[PDB]
Amino acid sequence: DSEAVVAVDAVSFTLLQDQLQSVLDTLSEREAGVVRLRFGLTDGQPRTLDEIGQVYGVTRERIRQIESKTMSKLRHPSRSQVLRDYL
Amino acid sequence: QRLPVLPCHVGDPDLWFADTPAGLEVAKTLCVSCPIRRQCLAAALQRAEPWGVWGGEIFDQGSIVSHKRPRGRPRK
Numbered sequence: 001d002s003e004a005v006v007a008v009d010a011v012s013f014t015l016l017q018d019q020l021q022s023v024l025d026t027l028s029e030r031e032a033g034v035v036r037l038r039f040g041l042t043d044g045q046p047r048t049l050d051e052i053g054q055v056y057g058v059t060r061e062r063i064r065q066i067e068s069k070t071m072s073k074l075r076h077p078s079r080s081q082v083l084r085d086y087l
Numbered sequence: 088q089r090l091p092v093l094p095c096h097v098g099d100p101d102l103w104f105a106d107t108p109a110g111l112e113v114a115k116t117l118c119v120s121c122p123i124r125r126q127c128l129a130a131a132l133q134r135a136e137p138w139g140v141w142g143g144e145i146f147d148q149g150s151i152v153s154h155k156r157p158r159g160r161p162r163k
């Protein structure tokens with residue numbers, strides 16, 4: 001059955017979600033909410049840039065600048081090693 | 088492996104983006120003993136990182152500044 005649950009990818013996916021929740025929780029609240037709403041980690045629905053800007057009360061260029069800075073912060077190795085081994 | 092010897096992720100990661108010129112100075116010089124300064128600095132220069140300490144050097148949005156300019160009137 002070449003399309004079954006491989007029983008180690010499921011537990012690896014659960015540990016990946018746990019580690020991603022940890023690394024996202026070690027940030028600022030506004031940046032973490034922006035990243036979650038941008039990549040759809042809340043409820044599986046990705047949100048638009050103007051939608052995040054509307055619900056957080058700032059402009060879209062401010063939102064995308066905060067997103068770029070937060071993506072740099074996550075790309076930094078100090079936060080990035082424990083997720084670098086997963087991929 | 089050599090992970091606890093790696094000076095990037097030894098301590099708190101929020102230090103390396105502190106917005107004071109004197110706070111990040113020990114963060115920049117703490118990568119003096121880093122074993123992977125060449126590849127880290129090379130990746131940081133090629134992918135144009137806009138923030139924080141990278142390869143034992145600070146970064147603006149595109150390039151390398153020597154020391155970050157403090158808040159206030161600069162010295163004549």
Ligand code: SF4
Nearest residue numbers: 095118121127142143
């Ligand atoms: S910024 Fe410097 S000290 Fe930090 S991981 Fe990269 S090379 Fe090592």
